[PDB]
Amino acid sequence: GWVRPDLGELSKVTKVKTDRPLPENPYHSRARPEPNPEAEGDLKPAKHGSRLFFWTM
Amino acid sequence: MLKIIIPTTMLLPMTWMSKHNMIWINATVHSLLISLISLSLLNQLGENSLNFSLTFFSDSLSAPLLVLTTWLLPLMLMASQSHLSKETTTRKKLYITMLILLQLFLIMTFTATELILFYILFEATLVPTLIIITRWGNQTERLNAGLYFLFYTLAGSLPLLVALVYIQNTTGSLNFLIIHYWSHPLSNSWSNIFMWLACIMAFMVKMPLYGLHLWLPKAHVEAPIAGSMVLAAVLLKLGGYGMMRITTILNPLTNYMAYPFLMLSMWGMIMTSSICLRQTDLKSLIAYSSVSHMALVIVAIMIQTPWSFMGATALMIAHGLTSSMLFCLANTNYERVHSRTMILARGLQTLLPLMATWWLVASLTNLALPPSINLIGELFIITASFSWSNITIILMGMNMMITALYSLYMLITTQRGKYTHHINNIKPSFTRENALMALHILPLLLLTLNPKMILGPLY
Numbered sequence A: 001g002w003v004r005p006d007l008g009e010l011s012k013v014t015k016v017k018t019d020r021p022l023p024e025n026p027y028h029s030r031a032r033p034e035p036n037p038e039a040e041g042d043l044k045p046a047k048h049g050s051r052l053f054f055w056t057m
Numbered sequence B: 001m002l003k004i005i006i007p008t009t010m011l012l013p014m015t016w017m018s019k020h021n022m023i024w025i026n027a028t029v030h031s032l033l034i035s036l037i038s039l040s041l042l043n044q045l046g047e048n049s050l051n052f053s054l055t056f057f058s059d060s061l062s063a064p065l066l067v068l069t070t071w072l073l074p075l076m077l078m079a080s081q082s083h084l085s086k087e088t089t090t091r092k093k094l095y096i097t098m099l100i101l102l103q104l105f106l107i108m109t110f111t112a113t114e115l116i117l118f119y120i121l122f123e124a125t126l127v128p129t130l131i132i133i134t135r136w137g138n139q140t141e142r143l144n145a146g147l148y149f150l151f152y153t154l155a156g157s158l159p160l161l162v163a164l165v166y167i168q169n170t171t172g173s174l175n176f177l178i179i180h181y182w183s184h185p186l187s188n189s190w191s192n193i194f195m196w197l198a199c200i201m202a203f204m205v206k207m208p209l210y211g212l213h214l215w216l217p218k219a220h221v222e223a224p225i226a227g228s229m230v231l232a233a234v235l236l237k238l239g240g241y242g243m244m245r246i247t248t249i250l251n252p253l254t255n256y257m258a259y260p261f262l263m264l265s266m267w268g269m270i271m272t273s274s275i276c277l278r279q280t281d282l283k284s285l286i287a288y289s290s291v292s293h294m295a296l297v298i299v300a301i302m303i304q305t306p307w308s309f310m311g312a313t314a315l316m317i318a319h320g321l322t323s324s325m326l327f328c329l330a331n332t333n334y335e336r337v338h339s340r341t342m343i344l345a346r347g348l349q350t351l352l353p354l355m356a357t358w359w360l361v362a363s364l365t366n367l368a369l370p371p372s373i374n375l376i377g378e379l380f381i382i383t384a385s386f387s388w389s390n391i392t393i394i395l396m397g398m399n400m401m402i403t404a405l406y407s408l409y410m411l412i413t414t415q416r417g418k419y420t421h422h423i424n425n426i427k428p429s430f431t432r433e434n435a436l437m438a439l440h441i442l443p444l445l446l447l448t449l450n451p452k453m454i455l456g457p458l459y
């Protein structure tokens, strides 16, 4: 009672039901380094301007 | 302070929009009015300076220099219009523009609160002077003179700039008030020695110090009359003023870093006074006399005492007036005879009596006759030097002798004796020339009545 698979059937992506637990860290990755914290707050004008040599603005 | 700066800036469109025959009148009248307005800066406080704003401030050291600059502009205009008559309208306006720009740069230089702004204006004064010398000088040497005037200055000032920015990286500021209040001693190290040299040598070149002075005879001789007047009367003092500002951060290093400069100043003062005794060119003699007086000013600033600072201020003002007058006196005879050889035109007292009187008064102030402010400054410096070391009198007194010896020598060579027979084109003195001499000499004499007004902050 064996039916030969039709053209296009053996190349299907199928689903598999397994009792094997899904691996957590398959790449064996280290802990990722913490990022630089953030930019936060409101933008205030520069204190006493550019503060270049003699420029008051 | 803008009440001085803005009218000076307005002088430019005024001369560029004036009628072809009205440029001199307008420029002279309005420069005189600007000088009258600037005369109000002489009201000084004592304790601290007049701080107009964050950018500009006035001191008892700055105010006489500012008044001298604003007063020198109309005299330069009066002295320039004779030999510039044949010039076109546009080139006359360009000459007046150079003079106005020079005054503007000097006025901003003497009042800048911050050392980089002072440095930028201090260098900016170079360009108009160079253009004046190399475009309106009479002889072929002027070009070479210009080069000497330029690279002597820059070779001194480029290190200073570096030092200045270095200072702002460590101190955090270059504002002169902050620099003075937060001043700290300099340790005894090679780095400190070279920073001291970078801070001092530009002003040394500007004085000029003996041995770095070769640009001055060339530049002052080859320049037109207004160029010589501004170079001797105001520009040299840019060195002195600068030193008086920058020595506040150089203690206690100056206690021993000043020995070579003191030796150079005293010996070269003797040397330049002696050079004046054997000089065939009349303008060269005046230039070397300026070198000797500035050497005395260098000694005063280097010994760092209140009496020496007061004497240096007084001598700077007095020498500015006297040297400008002497240059104008020599230029009158040059325009008569078209030669600067001192022995060509002799016995001029017979032909020009009032100009001979002007010559005599200028020679008297040159040799520091009491109670002129020339001698006030000289005597204060000599007393401070005597306190520094009693042997200095030996050199100082010697200088005095030689000074008189060459001053009267000039007077005797050009005014006395018999007139040269073949020179028959000596016309009577013009009212313009007599008025220029009077406008030089009368303020100098009036300053005797109120000497403190030129004695500086240490008074």
Ligand SMILES: CCCCCCCCCCCCCCCCC[C@@H](O)O[C@H](CO[C@H](O)CCCCCCCCCCCCCCC)COP(=O)(O)OCC[N+](C)(C)C
Pocket: B188, B189, B190, B193, B210, B211, B212, B257, B260, B261
């Ligand atoms: C034409 C006119 C131009 C202007 C002239 C400007 C003059 C500038 C001269 C500077 C004066 C002094 C500079 C430095 C101070 C002392 C210099 C040295 O000779 O003193 C001895 C220094 O010891 C040795 O002599 C080292 C210096 C010798 C090497 C330098 C070469 C000098 C040869 C002359 C070169 C010409 C210079 C001018 C070129 C135009 C002191 O010994 P010591 O107390 O233990 O060390 C002090 C320094 N510490 C504290 C940092 C350690």
Ligand SMILES: CCCCCCCC/C=C\CCCCCCCC(=O)O[C@H](COC(=O)CCCCCCC/C=C/CCCCCCCC)COP(=O)(O)OCCN
Pocket: B152, B153, B155, B156, B159, B162, B163, B166, B189, B190, B191, B192, B194, B195, B196, B197, B198, B199, B201, B205, B212
């Ligand atoms: C008309 C002719 C005038 C010629 C003037 C030439 C002399 C000018 C003075 C020296 C110029 C450069 C000096 C740099 C400015 C000083 C600022 C400073 O403090 O830097 C020093 C560094 O000093 C130097 O490196 C300068 C060394 C010299 C470099 C160039 C040599 C040129 C010839 C040297 C002798 C000539 C200078 C004097 C000449 C006198 C006038 C003839 C210390 O900084 P740090 O690196 O952080 O060190 C801190 C720990 N100690």
